[model samples]
Target: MSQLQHNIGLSIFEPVAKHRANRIICTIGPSTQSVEALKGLMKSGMSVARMNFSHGSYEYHQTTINNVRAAAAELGLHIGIALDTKGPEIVLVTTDPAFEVDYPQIYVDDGVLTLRVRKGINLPGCEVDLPAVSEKDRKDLQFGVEQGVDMIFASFIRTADQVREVRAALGEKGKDTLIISKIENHQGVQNIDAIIEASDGIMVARGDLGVEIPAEKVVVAQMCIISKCNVAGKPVICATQMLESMTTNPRPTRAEVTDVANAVFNGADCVMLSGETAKGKYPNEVVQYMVRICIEAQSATHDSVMFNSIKNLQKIPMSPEEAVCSSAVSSAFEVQAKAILVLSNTGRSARLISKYRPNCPIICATTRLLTCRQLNVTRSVESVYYDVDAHGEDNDREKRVQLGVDWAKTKGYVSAGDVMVIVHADHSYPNQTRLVRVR
Candidate 1:
């Protein structure tokens, strides 16, 4: 088959011309760590590759990173890498091999201290050991930065201070890497606002979260976190057990389908797969199912309420850049444009456009490859890396815009004469938007 034919089959259903707007993030593991498997993931609609630092060694993770890059380069696409930290956790280590504890049970040490277990664990009843942020985490951050990972998924974040500490470790060299605070415990839910303020994004990590909080409250917490992130103009991910059954079976249960749909309805920017894609019997099939479900949910999306609410929530004072982004999205919606094109240097303009959650796709062209990769978390944003001279003239703006239009056309995302809204910051006009007709 031709390249266009392959992409069309992989990305959209040709009959309806409908594409999945919400993104998919798949974790890398033994099953899907090979370069070929990574390439398959790219074609199967994986926007980001997640590395679970809780399990992998530096060498293993480095190999995964290299494979992901190789696959993206081979396919001519920009795929994001997220480093997930193993946050503060409590464990029990003892010499007795037969000791066990029934979870959902409360344990009191002597008379003063009490611990509640939400999930059942078979382990020796020994002195509980709490693990702190170690030097290894700092080293991982530095390594990820050097390797050009786009995002950090900090697990078990209970407070804003943890987010700040991770940021500090990243330092100025990795300032561009987005931090996604994972809310997995009661303390995290209590401090959601501060955590959201400190991090670039949020992830409702339902696995440990369900284990940390009551099982009945996981859905409620998911809704709350997604809504908060939407209002704050931050990308939120709904993760863990989204397609748990698919890890063993080729198809997912009806409940799993609804679970994924409900997350999209709740305004999640991304839905992630853990074991389903990492070590599943059918990794590619699982991703394909996720794409179909997201597309269906997106078609039924209540745009008026969701869009208007987000716009109203973002009704703070706007800077020049914000105004331009807002106007671009509004113009696209009013004109029913095919797509919104953004010329971004640091990925800020594209992110601003994404915050509004426009109905159409946002095509982003960035001068830096890292900027392109960093946009993986932004909803409905498709990024392309284009090079522009550092000291280019004013005409470079139009050149960049044309390049974006050409890319959209080449990708079959738009056609000749289709209307597109372009947003950019010019040296003279700074923060301006224009309507262009693809030629």
Candidate 2:
């Protein structure tokens, strides 16, 4: 592959800093909720601390959130807190303006404990008319909003309409919270196209989906969902059971290692840990193991075929921003530029660069903490929160670029005389994709 890249003139002439572009999302629970444990997970490569609403009390999740915030503050790092809503189960319920089903024979969740099927629902292929956002989910969303959670891993999303319902649940304050829809059921698999269109990100939730569909086909479903999100440029998380045994055992199973590697090979931006970090004996080790697998997978992959396939799918005559991102990365690969340094306000441009799958790092220098934290899920893109004086000269544009360069230098991603593809996405400086040499 290295020789192929060289033959294709895509290999770099010099060594750059080693970076793990893939992100790890660790669920916080009894074993990993302490400030000390949270810090350990963060240091071991946790980009997002996901709080599963299925298990913990509001206060418990709150404590976990608080500890995560405190740990991040102490470490001087930015990490995203995601609220993972326990979605409406297999059998739908209409608690609020609740509806009735045609039959009493609906498969409600927790069949052992609950019989909400006395509550009727309408179904064709059993399309139960239930509120995608349950009332309890509303409360949890409010809490997430009040606490400023960065992402919402909305569960059991089977349609774009449900995706809209989730955003509506967020209302005015939670509007900015990233919605990462979990594709868990056969219905969701069928509606994958529209769901990705409606979502900011996608999580290939294999656990429930495997049970919902044939366990044999979940792998096929995962590939379709992942590649759809990949081509659409939404960050995708390959979640659940990637390293299940690591929850108890210090080392992961060989099957688990291959699963994690395959997710990276399939182009996932992040891999999520459920039990492994939530109640696992070795939260830090699990993260490190996942990190090792992802980095190695990334090391082995990166090709023009994959890049061109995605690029070709993009419509021509793109917006200036899109043009700049794709062209800059194209140039980077041709020259083997050490990095692509970009200025972003909403982290939009940085993610656009990542969409093209550049082999080198994209040093996204931005002024927003949310931009810095939210971007943790993007592959091969490292955001530097450039908190300089916002009240500077017109050359502050250059200042932001300088921050990216300086950070890359300090991190050894770039060095003297290294070539970099620089982009300024500001409308005033529209269509600026230039090459510069570090002095």
Candidate 3:
């Protein structure tokens, strides 16, 4: 290694982490639903295992869920579960083969099936009206609530009211499950602001979105929704076919590689794989490639620039929670801190810190395993399950801080004397933004 010449007063650019900050959500299907396959995918850097609710029987899904948890237990890790709901977009006709009406053009999946339509213009999406949550969707929602999944990636969201309706369906018992609204239609783009406001997070579901509107407009919607989520401090996922070609082949096309890189540069908190990891022949390789792509893209980012823009969005006289997180991140950048440890209950403080895009990791120590799993979607956050019961106390701020610090060190994130910025809930201290040095 070449030694840095600290001649005069010049400083070098701080080294960004080799660790990829952005999370990866892998759609679990036939190829990767097994305990062995799930373990491989997790080792390849998949943070969340997504189960698409469009297909498979309840028993089949239950087996997959059981296998996922078994694999997670085997690995001794907190791998998250996300239930993806299919929205009211495509109409299936089994008996009649296919039929369509009231559209200028018709194009089926892969152009394998097509229909000649000579009707008046209506819209690109479905003309038939449907409720926000279909009957089948309600049943699936109950299953997710009962199973205690971490998050729900609701598809075909068009308006804010629809998001509210989904939340209502979750009800009192399922209220803790995070609802990540998937924007897939023109109406969703038109009412993006309201949707973002109502949602716990957002997912730019590009597959159906590409079908619902012009292809060019999908990019605009993706960027718009991502930035809005960044400002809102809500975790947003850029989903569908990120590394599509990897489904059949070991290598991805050049276009596919740049596509993943651009999503990271565009500020997506999480990038997802549909068929690539779901039914792909190379599920582990696909996730590995995605991890490499995200790490390189993260290195290319200039956090100093991104940080200022994010900080500027907040008004003056911020809340104590907001101020503590933002300042902690700011300190991380200034001192090139090895890591930022956050003691969060709901992972709110860690999520807020993630909004600033620090180059280092945010180790979120939370008592609940659900919080640990749910936080897997957020950028730069590595949530650790802190056992209060085993420790003989609750909210022990000193132990919480130490737990995160020790995890970071064990994971090779820090060393002796490296600066660590911390956020905790101890009112005993004059300020909660405590800085520490390893002994």
Residue 241 deviation, candidate 1, in Å? 0.5
Candidate 1's TM-score reads 0.87
Residue pairs with colliding backbones in model 3 are none
What is the lDDT of every predicted structure here?
A: 0.81, 0.82, 0.83
TM-score of each: 0.87, 0.87, 0.90
Q: Spell out the clash pairs found in candidate 2.
A: 94-98, 100-120, 100-121, 101-120, 101-121
Best by TM-score: 3
Flag the better candidate by TM-score, 2 or 3.
Answer: 3
What TM-score, to 2 decimals, does candidate 2 have?
0.87
Candidate 2's clash total is 5
lDDT of 1 by residue, 1-439 (tens): 2435443544333333265679999999998999999899889999999999877788999999999999999999889999998665335735354775222213232123345552323122334333325577888888899988999999778789888989989999988899999987787899999999999999999877776676789989999999999888888999988999999998999999999989998999999999898889889889999988888777666244566677776756877777788778889888888899988778878878888878788988787888778788888899876765563543557767777888888888889878999887666623778887887
Q: Model 3 off-target regions past 4 Å?
A: 1-16, 89-105, 110-126, 428-431
Q: Which ten residues in a row have the lowest lDDT in candidate 1?
A: 102-111
Q: For candidate 2, lDDT tens digit of each residue in 322-343?
A: 8888899899999989899988
For residue 98, give model 3's deviation from the true position in Å.
Answer: 12
